[PDB]
Amino acid sequence: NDLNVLVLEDEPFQRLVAVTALKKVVPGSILEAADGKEAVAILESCGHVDIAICDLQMSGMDGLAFLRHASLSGKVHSVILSSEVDPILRQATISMIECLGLNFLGDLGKPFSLERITALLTRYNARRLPSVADVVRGLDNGEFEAYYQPKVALDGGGLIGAEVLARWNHPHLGVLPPSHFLYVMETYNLVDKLFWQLFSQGLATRRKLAQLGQPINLAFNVHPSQLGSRALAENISALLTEFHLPPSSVMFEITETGLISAPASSLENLVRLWIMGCGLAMDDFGAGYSSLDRLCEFPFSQIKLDRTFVQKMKTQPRSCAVISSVVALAQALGISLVVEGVESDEQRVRLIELGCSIAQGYLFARPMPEQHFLDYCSGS
Amino acid sequence: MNDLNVLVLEDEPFQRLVAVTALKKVVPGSILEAADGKEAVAILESCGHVDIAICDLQMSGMDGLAFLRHASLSGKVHSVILSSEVDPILRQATISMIECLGLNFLGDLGKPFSLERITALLTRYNARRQDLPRQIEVAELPSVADVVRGLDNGEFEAYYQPKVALDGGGLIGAEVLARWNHPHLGVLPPSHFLYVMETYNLVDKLFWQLFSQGLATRRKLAQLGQPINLAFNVHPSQLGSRALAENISALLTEFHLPPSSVMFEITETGLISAPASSLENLVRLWIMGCGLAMDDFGAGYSSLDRLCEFPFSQIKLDRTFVQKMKTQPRSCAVISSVVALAQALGISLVVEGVESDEQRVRLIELGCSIAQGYLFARPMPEQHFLDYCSGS
Amino acid sequence: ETGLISAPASSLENLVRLWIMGCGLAMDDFGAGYSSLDRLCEFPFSQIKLDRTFVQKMKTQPRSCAVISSVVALAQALGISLVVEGVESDEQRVRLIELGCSIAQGYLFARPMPEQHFLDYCSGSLEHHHH
Amino acid sequence: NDLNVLVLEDEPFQRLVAVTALKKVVPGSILEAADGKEAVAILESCGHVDIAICDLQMSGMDGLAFLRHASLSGKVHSVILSSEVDPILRQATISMIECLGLNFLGDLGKPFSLERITALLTRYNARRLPSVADVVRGLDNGEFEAYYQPKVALDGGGLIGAEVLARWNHPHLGVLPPSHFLYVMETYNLVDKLFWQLFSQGLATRRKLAQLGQPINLAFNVHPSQLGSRALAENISALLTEFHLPPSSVMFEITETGLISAPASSLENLVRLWIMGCGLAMDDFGAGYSSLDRLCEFPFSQIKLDRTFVQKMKTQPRSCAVISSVVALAQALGISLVVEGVESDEQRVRLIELGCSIAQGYLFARPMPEQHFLDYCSGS
Amino acid sequence: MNDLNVLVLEDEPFQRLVAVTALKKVVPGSILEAADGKEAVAILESCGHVDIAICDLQMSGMDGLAFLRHASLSGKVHSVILSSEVDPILRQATISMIECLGLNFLGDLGKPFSLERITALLTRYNARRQDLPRQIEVAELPSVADVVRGLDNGEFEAYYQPKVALDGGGLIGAEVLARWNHPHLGVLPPSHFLYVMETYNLVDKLFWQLFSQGLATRRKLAQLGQPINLAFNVHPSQLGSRALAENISALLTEFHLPPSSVMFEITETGLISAPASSLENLVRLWIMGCGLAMDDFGAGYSSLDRLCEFPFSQIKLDRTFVQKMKTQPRSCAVISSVVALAQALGISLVVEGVESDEQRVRLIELGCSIAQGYLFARPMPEQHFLDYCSGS
Ligand SMILES: [Mg+2]
Ligand SMILES: [Mg+2]
Ligand SMILES: [Mg+2]
Ligand SMILES: [Mg+2]
């Protein structure tokens, strides 16, 4: 009311029947393409397209490449498939449409039953938690921004470094945390993609900080799956070069858990980064069995313990004992320890009493976007 | 409420009169009247919209349903009311069949046609009018005149669809099918001209154009050592002329072809609906030695008894049978009975509309042997067809 | 079959109640329309029956045999019973067995009888079977 | 919220599983019966039952008779069948539930899928145009009343007789005309039933009119299908006797159309009524071909022409010609003519000018319930 | 949000520890832990509700799925999370299978078990909590103790289900099935006790009670000239004892019965999961001359290779195969392959769960020959069964 449908249908009689069925039910314009090249030109100059329709059973490798064109244009919202999808590959097909960053509206067979074209229109406008399609589009569209949380010294004011955190400017929900997209990115293998957007932003921020005479070390989280990648280390350097920042300006964090399930060849990237001089933190330390055995076998330059140690100090003396033990450990290996989630002064002094040097939490600073951080940094 | 629009299809002038008189009293708007297909398609062409078509599903002078099919392609018709309240068991199937055409089923009128009942159906219509799909005047349904000129300007081409063995796809024969090389609409199947040709007695004209294009092709196959017989659809009206069989034989002789090189196909409904005088041509084609196929089979058995000797060498099962296999599995029982029938008569069985391999395997499982459909080969123009006939 | 064709619009209510109750339902004089195979498909009769002319035209008409065959297959594929009427002689009884028929009525077994004749027919038949 | 479900399930393990599945989703009470006798006793003392459930595939003739008990009690609204109904007899089964005056909510198979029990509950409460179930219940519950429209003389005030008209006191829609129920009654064969409720009411009204010294003849519409019935005439007399009213106090109307399609044996009832002395009108005269041939062959004592002749007089002189011809016809056979739908004085005088004696319309009186009519009658 | 409730089923103490440690950080509420079926059913019995069960679908020490089935009958469990992110092709089928139990599928946990991922699943749970069916403590799931006393008070009876030819219904044999004469709950099928008995090593006790009731019945059939063999389910655990075959033979001798009068049935999963030492009893039963059937078949072929000679005289197809025929027609291909398999091995095939005649006809069409199910006969107590065995 009024919609804008684009049908891709090669076979001319089929085209004829389809479009004619669409006139009856579809309030609004309708466009027509006899192949990929003609459809990609209807795109090359048109506004929004509410629904794209094409036939994946009949063709085939054209239909797929089209949908990508549909995807790349940024101009299409939803998809109806003009053949019935096989029950056994239903979810496969939907998921495939959604990794294009298109919404799957539905499917139906030629010649179209008119009641079925209504069902899907009603359903469509009825769409007026984020979906897979949403995440992919958000990512293909530079909506993801880097946030910054400082690692400060507990005693004094301090400013030692920062953890780069992923946030998403949602056009309707606003700023969101990883739990609302990492699932999707994790499941569909977009983590790498997000990583490189953020790593670039992060280095740009690192430059502005070097321009300002600030030794703020920027720490990035690396997903274990990336650790298996052939050229991660070689790509991190190429960018560190392109940006004229030195290795040591920068640090990569990997959880203890994720390090457990990491791919056979993870070490090839890890020796790289270590030699290079990049700092390497083992994050959420104390999560597996052999935590102490791990530090032994890999020269991590930092250890981080998480929100729960701090919270548990007061009510649970065993936490204090392990905080102290860890302090000793970092102390004896000559590396840094960051204690996360400090929210109160009580907590802060206790940590000092125990021996901890670095912290993060809402006491000092919540995660911040580039500018608020830069301002924060101009001040210590 | 407004200018409701009602088309009544009624063959029998006294029923028509009763119905129309009752409708005039109670219907706000125009009552249109058709006695036969010709009036009906004429009325349809001139109207912008027809809100309710009132239809009798068995007429002598008109095929009600075929008009509905044509009407559904027109864009112009909302709803259907049936004036025969018939056959309780088959009522749902009749509804769905109407509903798959694009059409909305309003109800049946009784053969009383009581005024009270009529207003019910109107209130009923009137409560649905908005929810119904827009009426548009679809330009893709060629007019009678427009069909009549195409047929006068040589733009109808024969296409050929192979009939093949279900295990393999080995070639056995082919059906010749009508396509319209429409000057500006592209290439049209029979949905877009056949019904008009039937209703204006232009089928005989189409058959002679296609039959000789086809003999040309059959000649080329012979020359290629390719013993593929070609089968042509004969519409029941064409059986009207006492000389059909003789004209067909003169033409076969003219093309240096024996009767056995060719087959003719008539629907079951067609064979049923033909006068004995007309049935005598099939007997003749049968004696000449042509193949004969009874087409769109599947409804029952009483067509077997029309003639002293069964002249048919082949039976073809209606396309809808393959589609219904999953949709309505009891139809597999009919496929079995028909397989059993053909075998017992020592004739062949073709099953049409075979599109997926899952259908192919089930058909083989039921005992089917010969098939046509998209799974094996689309209808082809001659040269594609000829090239197709090189691969064994 | 023809009766069902002309039946009143409410007929299905009674038929469905009978079916749901579990009484048998036979479609008699099967094949007298017009839509015979379609109709069987739309309602689950537990038995269909052939008119006696089918068996009579068996010598003259290979076609009659064919439709018997076809119907035998139809019933076996729907898992329902078929009764063939008009069995008047033994040679048509054996021909019917080659064709795959199983149940029959006809003069060869017994014309219609009043109760007591029928009971005595039944006793006798049971006695014959047990030897 | 909160519903009251009654499950009829013989097989005890099945009962166990069913009820347990119903606890999870059904907010409210649940009752249990191991057969018909125990269910008919849960009914014999309970309030409303929102949904009755029983299994029609497994049993059988018990399940049916139950539902009738459910029906007769007046206490149940809706039905879920506890087996899946066969696609081919879907409408048959639904229609069967609805002729019991129960609503078909839906069906499902044992053991119940929990999402399916939700779908149907949502659907059920979502029901909070009249249906078949509605008509049957309305009829089983004395909601249908007789209305009265007088046949007056055109010149003078006049009061000659009345046409008994069927109306339905709907508990939510209010007073409704035949078009909103005759379809249903016609389709499902309830016309007879409605007839006898109204005929009784009508005779009761006829007595009160005889008590008051009024020769108001009451005319009832007879459906053609009834005309085929073995004992219609014999039953009309038995009631005329039971009520001590004479045949001639009363008249039966049958349309010309319906008389055309009437059953072979319709005449057996028609000679009865004629001998008896009851008046017999041919209603909506002039609808077939052989109208004049009909009057010839059956001695109808009245002819009625409908709303459309009157309306057409002014703009269509041929109507006037046939009105006059009919006047002549009634005149020559010695019978009465009623002209229907007189709304205006102009219309009235014209009719007189033409020769018509009796009329009906909104000029004189719209159809009325027993009392307004009786009052109307006390006054002429 | 509240006291979430999470039960983790994990066999392997180091994975359990990793998972639990991660859950403690992030889950608001209690984390429950089970190493085996015993802990798991104990935890379940004491809990009022279990909001999320985290389950590993292949454990050595516990059948995860069987616990889920039992859990679904308990009323107490909302949702499932899987800790093996396995098998992409079979993922949908795995979901649906969970969903048909009553259960809600939340997602899979990775073998990382990342804290971020965990909170996603919790938010996800928390957004569904209301829409989910109420948790109630169903009293119909007999407790372990309660099962343990029934089994000590002789209230388990043998029932018999005929195996019959698909054309006709001619009698061929019968399976002996366990029923519980529950003092106050009525008559219960294995869903209500078997899983508990399996998990507390009480199956061996049930088998000896039923096996001798059954030999009694087999004796009565012999005496009646009724050569109906009776088949008994042997659970894999029972194969533990080196003397099973010898105990079974002593008992057969005691009842004046030859080994051939009897059959034993083990599931495919059972046969797969058994140590070779244990597989030696089947070899023994096979040599003694008992029938052997491999039960719930259909998954693949690698069970054929466990032993030097295939000791099985019969194969039975899993009940679900008949149900899937319409639902998923590709399963008809497996039925065909299994028919072909049995024939090639010269052994018999039973197909179970045959309820409608439309299934019966299709099974005959695929080549099946022997069947069990409601269409032919329900499980009967002895006398009904004996009376049933008079009619040929
Ligand atoms: Mg981190
Ligand atoms: Mg054909
Ligand atoms: Mg009247
Ligand atoms: Mg078994």
DSSP E243-303: THHHHHHHHHHHTT--GGGEEEEEEHHHHHTS-HHHHHHHHHHHHHT-EEEEEEE-S-SGG
Sequence letter at residue B365: E
HSE (side-chain half, CA atoms, 13 Å) at B292:
21
Structure-token match 């839509």, residue found: C35
CA B163, CA B87: separation in Å to the nearest integer?
A: 36
Cis peptide before A2 (omega within 30 of 0): yes
Contact between C12 and B89 under an 8 Å Cβ cutoff? The reply is yes
**Among E112, E120, E328, beta carbon nearest to A257:** E112
CA E194, CA D17: separation in Å to the nearest integer?
A: 17
Sequence letter at residue C42: E
CA D42, CA D49: separation in Å to the nearest integer?
A: 10
Among the listed residues C71, C19, C79, the one whose alpha carbon sits nearest the alpha carbon of residue C49: C71
Q: Is there a single domain that holds both residue B108 and residue B206?
A: no
Is E117 within 8 Å of A289 when comparing Cβ atoms? no
CA C12, CA D119: separation in Å to the nearest integer?
A: 28
SS3 content of chain D, % helix, strand, coil (to 5): 45, 20, 30
Experimental method: X-ray
List chain B residues with CB under 8 Å of E368: none
Contact between D34 and D54 under an 8 Å Cβ cutoff? The reply is no
Cα separation values, E300 from E89, E338, E352, Å: 15, 10, 18
Helix (H) or strand (E) holding D302: strand D302-305
Q: What is the CATH number of the domain that holds E189?
A: 3.20.20.450
CA A187, CA A180: separation in Å to the nearest integer?
A: 12
Phi-psi region of D73 (alpha: psi -120 to 50; beta: other; left: phi over 0): alpha
**Residue C76 exposed, middle or buried by CB count within 10 Å (0-12, 13-18, 19+):** buried
The residue in chain C having the minimum alpha-carbon distance to the alpha carbon of residue D87 is: C42
Among the listed residues D188, D183, D164, the one whose alpha carbon sits nearest the alpha carbon of residue D283: D164
3-state secondary structure of E24: helix
Q: Is there a single domain that holds both residue E254 and residue E242?
A: yes
Residues E268-275: contacts with CB under 8 Å, at least 24 apart? E268/E294, E268/E295, E268/E296, E268/E297, E268/E298, E268/E299, E268/E303, E269/E296, E269/E299, E270/E235, E270/E236, E270/E295, E271/E236, E271/E303, E271/E306, E272/E302, E272/E303, E272/E306, E273/E236, E274/E236, E274/E239
Our CA angle for C11, C17, C23, nearest 5°, is 110
For E268-391, list the strands marked E by DSSP: 291-297, 314-317, 348-352, 370-372
Strand A144-153 versus strand A368-369 pairing type: antiparallel
Q: How far is the CA of B174 from the centre of ligand 2 (A)?
A: 10
Contact between A113 and A88 under an 8 Å Cβ cutoff? The reply is no
Last-in-domain residue among B117, B136, B155: B136
Sequence letter at residue A287: A
Q: Is there a single domain that holds both residue E178 and residue E225?
A: yes
Structure-token match 């466009």, residue found: A31
Is C16 within 8 Å of D61 when comparing Cβ atoms? no
Q: How far is the CA of D283 from the centre of ligand 3 (A)?
A: 6
Where b means 16+ CB within 10 Å and e means fewer, A135-152 reads bbbbbeeebbbbbbbbbb
Our CA angle for A155, A158, A159, nearest 5°, is 150
CA C68, CA B64: separation in Å to the nearest integer?
A: 33
Cis peptide before A111 (omega within 30 of 0): yes
Q: How many residues are there in chain D?
A: 380
Among the listed residues D172, D168, D174, the one whose alpha carbon sits nearest the alpha carbon of residue D147: D168
Strand B171-182 versus strand B156-165 pairing type: antiparallel
Paired tokens of D272: 């009865």
CA B200, CA B148: separation in Å to the nearest integer?
A: 9
CA A257, CA E22: separation in Å to the nearest integer?
A: 9
Cα separation values, D114 from D119, E94, E342, Å: 9, 18, 38
Which amino acids of B are annotated catalytic? 352
3-state secondary structure of B179: strand
Structure-token match 């008389």, residue found: D259
Cβ within 8 Å of E, D 163-202: none
**Residue D315 exposed, middle or buried by CB count within 10 Å (0-12, 13-18, 19+):** exposed
Backbone φ and ψ of C125, nearest 5° = -65, -45
Q: Is there a single domain that holds both residue B258 and residue B335?
A: yes
Which residues, other chains included, contact D251 with Cβ-Cβ below 8 Å and sequence gap of 6+?
Answer: D161, D217, D218, D219, D220, D278, D279, D280, D281, D301, D302
- Tell me whether B254 touches chain E (CB under 8 Å): no
CA D281, CA D258: separation in Å to the nearest integer?
A: 13
- Selected for mutation to probe chain D from E96, E97, E138, E182 (highest D CB count within 10 Å) is E138
Among the listed residues E58, E54, E32, the one whose alpha carbon sits nearest the alpha carbon of residue E44: E32
Q: Which of E155, E246, E352, E382 is flagged as catalytic? A: E352
Sequence letter at residue A13: F
Contact between E179 and E159 under an 8 Å Cβ cutoff? The reply is yes
Task: Tally the domains of chain E.
Answer: 2
3-state secondary structure of E143: coil
Q: How far is the CA of E328 from the centre of ligand 4 (A)?
A: 24
Q: Is there a single domain that holds both residue A6 and residue A150?
A: no
CA B352, CA B166: separation in Å to the nearest integer?
A: 11
DSSP string, C31-94: T-SS-HHHHHHHS--SEEEE-THHHHTTTT-HHHHHHHHHHHHHHHHTT-EEEE----SHHHHH
CA B72, CA B78: separation in Å to the nearest integer?
A: 9
Distance from CA of B307 to the nearest CA of D (A): 35
Q: Is there a single domain that holds both residue E262 and residue E382?
A: yes
Distance from CA of D232 to the nearest CA of C (A): 20
Tally C-beta pairs within 8 A across D and E.
26
Summarize the annotated binding site of E as residue ranges: 175, 233, 265, 295
Strand D368-369 versus strand D144-153 pairing type: antiparallel
- Residue A283, annotated as binding a ligand: yes
Q: Is there a single domain that holds both residue A78 and residue A194?
A: no
Q: Is there a single domain that holds both residue D102 and residue D56?
A: yes
Which strands make up the sheet holding D76-81, listed edge to edge?
Answer: D28-33, D3-8, D49-54, D76-81, D103-107
Cα separation values, B218 from A129, B225, B283, B353, D347, Å: 65, 11, 23, 24, 78
Phi-psi region of A86 (alpha: psi -120 to 50; beta: other; left: phi over 0): beta
Among the listed residues E350, C44, E170, B117, the one whose alpha carbon sits nearest the alpha carbon of residue D255: B117
Last-in-domain residue among B113, B136, B159: B136
Where b means 16+ CB within 10 Å and e means fewer, E263-300 reads bbbbbbbbbeebeeebbebbbbbbebebbbbbbbbbee
β-sheet bridge partners, residue E50: E77
Widest CA span in chain A: 82
Whose atoms come closest to the Cα of E353: which ligand? 4
Contact between C49 and C29 under an 8 Å Cβ cutoff? The reply is yes
The residue in chain B having the minimum alpha-carbon distance to the alpha carbon of residue E332 is: B362
List chain C residues with CB under 8 Å of B85: 9
Contact between E273 and E231 under an 8 Å Cβ cutoff? The reply is no
Cβ of B127: how many Cβ atoms within 10 Å?
A: 10
Q: Is there a single domain that holds both residue B144 and residue B177?
A: yes
CA D282, CA D291: separation in Å to the nearest integer?
A: 10
Q: Is C85 among the catalytic positions?
A: yes
Where b means 16+ CB within 10 Å and e means fewer, A170-204 reads beeeeebbbbbbbbbbbbeebbeebbebbbebbbe
CA A202, CA A210: separation in Å to the nearest integer?
A: 12
Which residues, other chains included, contact D122 with Cβ-Cβ below 8 Å and sequence gap of 6+?
Answer: none
3-state secondary structure of E92: helix
- Tell me whether D99 touches chain C (CB under 8 Å): yes
Cβ of E108: how many Cβ atoms within 10 Å?
A: 21
CA A66, CA A44: separation in Å to the nearest integer?
A: 13
Sequence letter at residue C61: Q
Sequence letter at residue A341: G
**Among A12, A25, A118, beta carbon nearest to B186:** A12
Touch criterion met for A and E (3+ Cβ pairs within 8 Å): yes
β-sheet bridge partners, residue B263: B231, B291
Among the listed residues D168, D181, D266, the one whose alpha carbon sits nearest the alpha carbon of residue D225: D266
3-state secondary structure of D278: coil
Give me the helices (H) in A173-299, please. Answer: 182-188, 191-211, 232-242, 256-260, 266-276, 291-297
Helix (H) or strand (E) holding D370: helix D370-377
Cβ of B74: how many Cβ atoms within 10 Å?
A: 21
Paired tokens of B144: 């009678």
Contact between B372 and C101 under an 8 Å Cβ cutoff? The reply is no
Q: What does the CA dihedral A65, A68, A69, A74 come to, rounded to 10 degrees?
A: 170
Q: How many residues are there in chain E?
A: 392
CA D196, CA E139: separation in Å to the nearest integer?
A: 54
SS3 content of chain A, % helix, strand, coil (to 5): 45, 20, 30
3-state secondary structure of A188: helix
In chain C, which residues touch D (CB < 8 A)? 8-10, 12-13, 15-17, 19-22, 41-44
Cβ of D245: how many Cβ atoms within 10 Å?
A: 19
Is E188 within 8 Å of D23 when comparing Cβ atoms? no
Q: How far is the CA of A221 from the centre of ligand 1 (A)?
A: 6
Cα separation values, E163 from D329, E167, E231, E292, Å: 82, 12, 10, 15
List chain B residues with CB under 8 Å of E358: 329-330
- Selected for mutation to probe chain B from A14, A20, A113, A118 (highest B CB count within 10 Å) is A20
3-state secondary structure of D73: helix
Sequence letter at residue B28: P
- Tell me whether E337 touches chain B (CB under 8 Å): no
Structure-token match 């040097």, residue found: A357
Paired tokens of B210: 């296609």
Widest CA span in chain E: 70
Q: What is the CATH number of the domain that holds E58?
A: 3.40.50.2300
Backbone φ and ψ of B364, nearest 5° = -60, -45
CA E42, CA E59: separation in Å to the nearest integer?
A: 18
Cβ of A269: how many Cβ atoms within 10 Å?
A: 23
3-state secondary structure of D87: helix
Q: How far is the CA of D263 from the centre of ligand 3 (A)?
A: 19
Backbone φ and ψ of B201, nearest 5° = 55, 50
Strand B370-371 versus strand B156-165 pairing type: antiparallel
Helix (H) or strand (E) holding C128: helix C115-129
Q: How far is the CA of D20 from the centre of ligand 4 (A)?
A: 27
The residue in chain C having the minimum alpha-carbon distance to the alpha carbon of residue D88 is: C42
Our CA angle for E77, E78, E83, nearest 5°, is 90
Paired tokens of D62: 């018990």
Distance from CA of A32 to the nearest CA of B (A): 15
Our CA angle for A11, A17, A22, nearest 5°, is 120
Among the listed residues A84, A104, A124, A111, the one whose alpha carbon sits nearest the alpha carbon of residue A19: A111
Question: What resolution, expressed in A, was reported for this entry?
Answer: 2.5
Backbone φ and ψ of B240, nearest 5° = -45, -50
Range of the domain at E1: 1-136
- Selected for mutation to probe chain B from C34, C36, C50, C57 (highest B CB count within 10 Å) is C34
Where b means 16+ CB within 10 Å and e means fewer, A108-132 reads bebebebebbeebbeebeeeeebeb
- Selected for mutation to probe chain A from E12, E17, E20, E21 (highest A CB count within 10 Å) is E21
Q: Is there a single domain that holds both residue E176 and residue E320?
A: yes
Backbone φ and ψ of A379, nearest 5° = 145, 100
Is B358 within 8 Å of E326 when comparing Cβ atoms? no
Which residues, other chains included, contact D369 with Cβ-Cβ below 8 Å and sequence gap of 6+?
Answer: D145, D146, D147, D148, D167
Give me the helices (H) in chain A, please. Answer: 12-25, 36-44, 61-73, 90-98, 114-125, 132-139, 182-188, 191-211, 232-242, 256-260, 266-276, 291-297, 307-312, 317-333, 345-354, 370-377
Q: Is there a single domain that holds both residue B262 and residue B368?
A: yes
CA A163, CA A221: separation in Å to the nearest integer?
A: 8
Last-in-domain residue among E95, E117, E136: E136
CA B254, CA D53: separation in Å to the nearest integer?
A: 75
Q: How far is CA E362 from the centre of its chain?
A: 26
Touch criterion met for A and C (3+ Cβ pairs within 8 Å): no
Where b means 16+ CB within 10 Å and e means fewer, E345-379 reads eebbbbbbbbebebbbbbbbbbebbbbbbebbbeb
HSE (side-chain half, CA atoms, 13 Å) at E332:
19
Distance from CA of C110 to the nearest CA of E (A): 26
CA A33, CA A39: separation in Å to the nearest integer?
A: 5
β-sheet bridge partners, residue E314: E293, E348
CA E26, CA E17: separation in Å to the nearest integer?
A: 15
Is E75 within 8 Å of D12 when comparing Cβ atoms? no
Whose atoms come closest to the Cα of B265: which ligand? 2
Which residues, other chains included, contact A353 with Cβ-Cβ below 8 Å and sequence gap of 6+?
Answer: none
Cβ of A168: how many Cβ atoms within 10 Å?
A: 21
β-sheet bridge partners, residue E267: E295
Q: How many residues are there in chain A?
A: 380
CA D184, CA D134: separation in Å to the nearest integer?
A: 10
Q: How far is the CA of E386 from the centre of ligand 4 (A)?
A: 20
CA gyration radius, chain D: 26
Q: How far is CA A379 from the centre of its chain?
A: 31
Q: What does the CA dihedral E206, E207, E208, E213 come to, rounded to 10 degrees?
A: 100
Q: Is there a single domain that holds both residue A141 and residue A106?
A: no
Whose atoms come closest to the Cα of B372: which ligand? 2
Which residues, other chains included, contact C80 with Cβ-Cβ below 8 Å and sequence gap of 6+?
Answer: C45, C46, C47, C48
Which residues, other chains included, contact C81 with Cβ-Cβ below 8 Å and sequence gap of 6+?
Answer: C46, C47, C48, C75, C102, C103
